Design a protein around this ligand. Sequence first.
Ligand code: NA
Length: 736
Amino acid sequence: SAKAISEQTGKELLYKFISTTSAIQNRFKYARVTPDTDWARLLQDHPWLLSQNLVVKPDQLIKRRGKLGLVGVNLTLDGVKSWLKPRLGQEATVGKATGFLKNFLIEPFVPHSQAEEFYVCIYATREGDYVLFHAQKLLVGVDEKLNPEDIKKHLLVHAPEDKKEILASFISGLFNFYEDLYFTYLEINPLVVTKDGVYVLDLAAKVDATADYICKVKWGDIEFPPPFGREAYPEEAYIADLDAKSGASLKLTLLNPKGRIWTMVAGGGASVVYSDTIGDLGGVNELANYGEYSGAPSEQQTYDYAKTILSLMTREKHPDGKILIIGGSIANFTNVAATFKGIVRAIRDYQGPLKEHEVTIFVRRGGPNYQEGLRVMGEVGKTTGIPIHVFGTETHMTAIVGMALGHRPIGKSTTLFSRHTKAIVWGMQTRAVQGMLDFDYVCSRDEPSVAAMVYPFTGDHKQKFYWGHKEILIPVFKNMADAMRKHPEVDVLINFASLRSAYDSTMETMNYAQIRTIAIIAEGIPEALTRKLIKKADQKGVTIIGPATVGGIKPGCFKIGNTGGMLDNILASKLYRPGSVAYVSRSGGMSNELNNIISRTTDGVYEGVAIGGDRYPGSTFMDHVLRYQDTPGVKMIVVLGEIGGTEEYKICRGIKEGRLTKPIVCWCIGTCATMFSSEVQFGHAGACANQASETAVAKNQALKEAGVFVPRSFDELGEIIQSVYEDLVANGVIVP
Ligand code: NA
């Protein structure tokens, strides 16, 4: 996810690391003011405070501080102390948000003309980074460079020739700094340029937090502050530390520490849906947290996550007690037994405080070993006396929310996969490959879908597998070149590389034209690298599914890695033979919920794809919707959209232009995001809305107006899918 940084942090980074021949005035002339400031030290460390006039403002992610009257301008140091006395430690309201003014930044006042102020902004898109100046707009493409002469010719057309060389030089330095330190947004408004040089009067910025492993040295102990209106809490940092030390995903944001509605949901998608449901039932004001765990965390990691929740919800008593919602989709991959054993351990260690605080627990879960998981979850309820109501896959995912709240407890290729698909798997993933072979067998495939594996940290060798009951060998290669030249029949590669090596291994794969489809599994790739992956993929005509995805499945033909889980899920959801329903979602866990939902209301899934949660997926919703339009076996299309970006609108335009004619059912998750006083970023790195059009509510209305079938909520998604299906059956379009 991209995260905002304070103005001081951004100016800190800029003063230290901008590489420019321009003169940047007042570098390191700032002073941070908190209620705990030692004002004697402050004057000692920043003596310029006493010898020139100053500017004071809060540094707490509040924009338009001028229009809000939150900027003392051209004051002496004594005037600053006085300007601060009514304001420091006092509440303030910016739009919907209310919070304490507690962090201020003092800087020298810069006498300047109105004409010496300039606007500069750099922000990232899929196609590269745009540079704004004034409004002049220039696109720097992926893997391109910003020629200072390109700045002079497009940005500085209406600029005086004398100021033209310091502006181009500063912007060139600012852009390289922007790129080197993995910024995604950098705004200076105003940038003051006088005869003495360049002044950075204001700075707002966001950096790609996933690039920590690349930028550690220069970022230092970088601080990502909460949005104005909310506070930061030590438990969030603790969980974020668990997230860094694990390939699994672990996230937690506190919304209301005193609220009585607590969630511990698996999956970035599912956790947004439970929050949406809670919001629809009036519980937003009592919603204590948003968070998720996914990517198959261990028993121990899940215990550490769960115990943070249980401690946070036993800090004080609520007269009506409290409720804990332990939900999730039917997981593809996460071990339900292993993770619920960890939650059970936490519940056990906190059973005293939980009974003391009158906590009622509601559980809904499916996935690998979910029967054991639900059993041990009911066992701990009986031995502790804690009321725990447990439900399985038979129960609608969000049903436990209503139970808990209804009262207070008393164009690229059309076809990617076929029965004949042969794939290379990058990484050591015996369990994933075996899960694919089991699926291939019950699908009545002639041959295994995995022809070879590649892992450059071991030598060439064979690997035993089970094909049905018989045992077989699949070659494992150290060098990708060897696997490719010996298996020209392979056209799919499923990349299980970690986030650190996924970039290079995927770029290497695209040197082999025989590979037409690449699934990138890893979550946490920096967005700027994925853009380079997208650029090369587009140049080579290679379809990329991912990153940050479990993959997808084509019943009867092929399934990417862990998608679809164990045989018992393959059989229950009828994923061993195709139906007429195709779907695409961002969430991998929710995609398996759709497998189950579609299995129960139609003839079954024809093909399903999870494009991943990252901001720039290798393939988009529209890309796969188009494939389904052009696939005759597909008769209806289901899209599980999400807040953030404008991708779903391309579906609207496609209908309006006659390109898309088959029935489309779509629901966009994230409707509760607009109910909050502050912004909240969900589990998926791309689930962030800037404009009103990027909200799930706005997209749902737009989709519905264009002829898409949109349910009222996620709860009715299964209803409207069954209803569209039966029409097609009645009209003869589908014959089971
Ligand atoms: Na992680």
